[PDB]
Amino acid sequence: SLTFSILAHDPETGAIGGAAATGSLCVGGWVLRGDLNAGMSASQGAAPSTFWGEEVLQHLRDGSHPEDAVNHVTSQDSGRAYRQLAAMDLLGNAAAFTGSENQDIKGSVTFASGIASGNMLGDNSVLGAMTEAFVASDLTFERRLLAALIAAEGAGGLLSAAMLVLHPDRPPVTLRIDYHPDNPIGALEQLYQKATTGDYADWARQVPVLSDKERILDEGHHHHHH
């Protein structure tokens, strides 16, 4: 199905993240993985391999350049032509592999702090528009990722969308619309606003994070409890 994904590093904060949308279900579950000790990966294509997504991160942890990590993982797989893989390290270096048996139009665009990839696209300009939107945006990192999904969509239906953002001072921000009949990206933005503002955001800053693993709720009396 129509598929596009973007991985990026946010230099100012050291956050890493990605976002994706497809014309099928559960894109967040299939495609997006990440670890603050490794980088980000997007594993997709006609016959996506969950293994590729996990294993490429291990190669990064173990000191492979993204190009070599992607090549190591894909070369070992006789079915590689039917899938597509992108990976980015903690400093924004990135590489992709695009199998020849994925549906046209395919493949990938690197840019200073990330990588866009996709397949079953209507035009080259889908990935170009995605990249331009991400790099041109002066919004917060998460909104840049959203802007990228919207531009990719506009350059072309989609049924699922997701975002994943990691930072050592924050719990993972994992936001999934696994099915929406007509506008999963819009539904993702709504979820993003709810997940990053008000009571919920106030609660979410009071839980364990990588830099404060034993964090508990704020001390003292409160009239409310999430």
How many Cβ atoms are within 10 Å of 40's Cβ, its own excluded?
34
Alpha-carbon distances of 38 from 41, 110, 133, 221, rounded to whole Å = 9, 18, 26, 40
**Spatial distance between the Cα atoms of 91 and 20, rounded to a whole number of angstroms:** 21
159 lies in some domain: yes
219 within some domain: no
In whole angstroms, give the CA distance from residue 153 to residue 70.
26
Judged by phi (left if over 0) then psi (alpha if -120 to 50, else beta), residue 218 lies in: beta
Task: Dig out the tokens for 78 from the structure.
Answer: 């006789």
Q: Give the CATH number, domain containing residue 162.
A: 3.60.20.10
Instruction: Supply the range of the domain harboring residue 155.
Output: 1-213
> Domain for residue 102, yes or no?
yes
Q: b/e per residue, 63-78, with b = 16+ CB within 10 A?
A: ebebeebbbebbeebe
Residue 67 placed within a domain: yes
Would you say residue 198 lies in a domain? Answer: yes
Q: With DSSP H G I counted as helix, E B as strand and the rest as coil, what are the percentages for the chain, rounded to 5?
A: 35, 25, 40
E-assigned strand segments in 45-134: 84-89, 94-98, 107-111, 114-119
Residue ranges in 76-183 assigned as alpha helix (H): 125-136, 141-154
Judge whether 54 lies within some domain: yes
Three-state SS for 126? helix
Resolution (A): 1.6
Task: Judge whether 98 lies within some domain.
Answer: yes
What's the number of domains the chain is made of? 1
Strand, coil or helix: what is 107?
strand
> What gap in Å lies between CA 107 and CA 34, rounded to an integer?
21
Residue 86 has phi, psi (to 5 degrees) of -135, 145
Q: Within 13 Å and on the Cβ side, how many CA atoms surround 71?
A: 5
Task: Give domain status of residue 133, yes or no.
Answer: yes
